[PDB]
Design a protein around this ligand. Structure first.
Ligand code: SRM
Ligand code: SF4
Ligand SMILES: [Cl-]
Ligand SMILES: [Cl-]
Ligand SMILES: [K+]
Length: 538
């Protein structure tokens, strides 16, 4: 690869990072949006204050302001639901390691409550909160309210570093490798500039997903992250081996590969910065389907990319990977739902099933109440869109199990529900081909009525090829499509995926059967479970 290819393509100008004039040819429309006006100015220069005052019908009359609300606002975690909930915004947080408080939960509930039938909230596949129903005029007050309770929504969408995922059992599991919270906290603080905004990492060629591993279970899905920190001792020192470039897209799904790099634990932020700077400086900015970091790694080769990371490290030092990491390959992924003892004697955590991750304001208040009465006011989110309430004095468990709300958010739902994951789908998402959340619950309920089983089969439902619900990791995955019934009528369907494995022995699933009408999935799935997963007809 020629030396000219390694010239940084962006430069700092007045606090922000912009494409250099000579690298602007052939760029995609999103890159043009970023050049036309720096999205971070909406927050960092309080551009949102005046924008929020303009009636949305007027906003839609000019490209600049329409791009503000449809594109640039995603840098403030605000997502206009133009097609399916016009004039309303989904709002997405930074929530490193999935950790929330009862006060934060009540605040979020109070926001969605205002919007009535237009409001609700969702736990995401990055153990994060999304709230719904937000109107533009309310945005300045919501931003203030979030800050007041110690939350940020910065840089959660578009060409930004996404929610830092960690071990949902961090600090509490007797079997953890290393508490991931300090590291995911540091990453989030770095990414968001301590909630003020960090323009140095907000003009990436594309989204970028990080995780820090602290579990033998690999709850963090390191194989599908742009950067995964794998805990590893090297030459008597604790640190992390680095995996890079994992991603899913409509066009291509790839597992992360070794960078062949180990960093001491204190270098977590420095190496995150170095990798992001290399991606920012050198990444392709044409066809959006070829802008994820793995495409850069393929273009330079992993060694060429590694050299770019190395030159951006303090003292330009980057050690090679440790021959072994601390993750034990002899491991069975553990169920976290139900009551489990913590490493702190006399304390338990409880995992509660949240059906397809969907909650209303009243539900959130009740969960916050439980966390206060039984725990320490902490609620943890998981990437299967469930919750854990930690730090419960074990003597309180008997009373907790009798709480009425646990009939809805159960510590021991049927096994197929335990593993069920579903994206937003067409209730709110404009890209969705099908409805996902209600359908997946209905189908799963019918399937489980017909068969019993003991294997923890994981079913993932995603509404379009963006695969936000990660169908390629599922035992049985369902990707939304339109198909045809026996009479040739248009019906909702799914492409069915098999072969996904998680944990250390990970594998990406692939399409098994295309174009199955959703109304025909129950018998197909029942038979798959009996024939391949040991299920028994009732
Ligand atoms: C909420 C969530 C799914 C869920 O129900 O949990 C979600 C929802 C959306 N995703 Fe995603 N993605 C979610 C995790 C993912 C993941 C899974 C992951 O991170 O492990 C992926 C696949 C992994 C990956 O990115 O490598 C994913 C791949 C995408 C893509 C395809 C990326 C690509 O390279 O092509 C898009 C479209 C895009 O970015 O161009 C997308 C775009 C979208 C948008 C923002 C599209 C839009 O604006 O409507 C969706 C918002 C719908 C809504 O109203 O909720 N989403 N999205 C997840 C939020 C995570 C978070 O808290 O930050
Ligand atoms: S997979 Fe498609 S339908 Fe589901 S949330 Fe992502 S973009 Fe929307
Ligand atoms: Cl986005
Ligand atoms: Cl839309
Ligand atoms: K769930």
């Amino acid at each position: 690869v020629a030396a000219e290819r390694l010239e940084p393509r962006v430069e700092e100008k007045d606090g922000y990072w912009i494409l250099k004039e000579q690298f602007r040819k052939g760029i995609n429309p999103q890159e043009k949006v970023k050049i036309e006006k720096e999205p971070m100015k909406l927050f960092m220069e309080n551009g949102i204050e005046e924008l929020a005052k303009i009636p949305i019908e007027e906003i839609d009359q000019s490209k600049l302001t329409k791009d503000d609300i449809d594109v640039r606002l995603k840098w403030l975690g605000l997502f206009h639901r133009r097609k399916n909930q016009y004039g309303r915004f989904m709002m997405r947080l930074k929530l490193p390691n999935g950790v929330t408080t009862s006060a934060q939960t009540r605040y979020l509930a109070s926001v969605i409550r205002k919007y009535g039938k237009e409001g609700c909230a969702d736990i995401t596949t990055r153990q994060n909160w999304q709230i719904r129903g937000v109107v533009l005029p309310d945005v300045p007050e919501i931003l203030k309210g979030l800050a007041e309770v110690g939350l940020t929504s910065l840089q959660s969408g578009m060409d930004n570093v996404r929610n830092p995922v960690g071990n949902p059992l961090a600090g509490i599991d007797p079997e953890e490798i290393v508490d991931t919270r300090p590291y995911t906290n540091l990453l989030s603080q770095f990414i968001t500039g301590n909630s003020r905004g960090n323009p140095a990492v907000s003009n990436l060629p594309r989204k970028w997903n990080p995780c820090v591993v602290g579990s033998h279970d690999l709850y963090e899905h390191p194989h599908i992250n742009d950067l995964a920190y794998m805990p590893a001792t090297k030459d008597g020192r604790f640190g992390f081996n680095l995996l890079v470039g994992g991603f899913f897209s409509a066009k291509r799904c790839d597992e992360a590969i070794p960078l062949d790099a180990w960093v001491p634990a204190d270098d977590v932020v420095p190496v995150c910065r170095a990798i992001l700077e290399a991606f920012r400086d050198l990444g392709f900015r044409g066809n959006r389907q070829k802008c994820r970091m793995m495409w850069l790694i393929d273009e330079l080769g992993v060694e060429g990319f590694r050299a770019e990371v190395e030159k951006r490290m303090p003292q330009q030092q980057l050690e090679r990977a440790s021959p072994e990491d601390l993750v034990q390959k002899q491991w069975e992924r553990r169920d976290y739902l139900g009551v489990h003892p913590q490493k702190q004697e006399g304390y338990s955590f409880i995992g509660l099933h949240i059906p397809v991750g969907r909650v209303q304001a009243d539900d959130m208040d009740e969960l916050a109440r439980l966390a206060d009465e039984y725990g320490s006011g902490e609620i943890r989110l998981t990437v299967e869109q469930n919750i854990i309430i930690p730090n419960i004095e074990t003597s309180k468990i008997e009373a907790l199990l009798k709480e009425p709300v646990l009939s809805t958010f159960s510590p021991d739902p049927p096994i197929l529900m335990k593993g069920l994951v579903a994206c937003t789908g067409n209730q709110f998402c404009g890209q969705a081909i099908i409805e996902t959340k209600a359908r997946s619950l209905k189908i799963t309920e019918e399937v489980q009525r017909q068969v019993s089983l003991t294997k923890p089969v994981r079913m993932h439902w995603t509404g379009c090829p963006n695969t936000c619900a990660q169908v390629q990791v599922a035992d049985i995955g369902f990707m939304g499509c339109l198909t045809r019934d026996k009479n040739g009528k248009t019906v909702e369907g799914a492409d069915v995926f098999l072969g996904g494995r998680i944990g250390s022995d990970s594998h990406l699933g692939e399409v098994y059967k295309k174009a199955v009408p959703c109304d025909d999935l129950v018998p197909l799935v029942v038979d798959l479970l009996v024939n391949n997963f040991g299920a028994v007809p009732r």
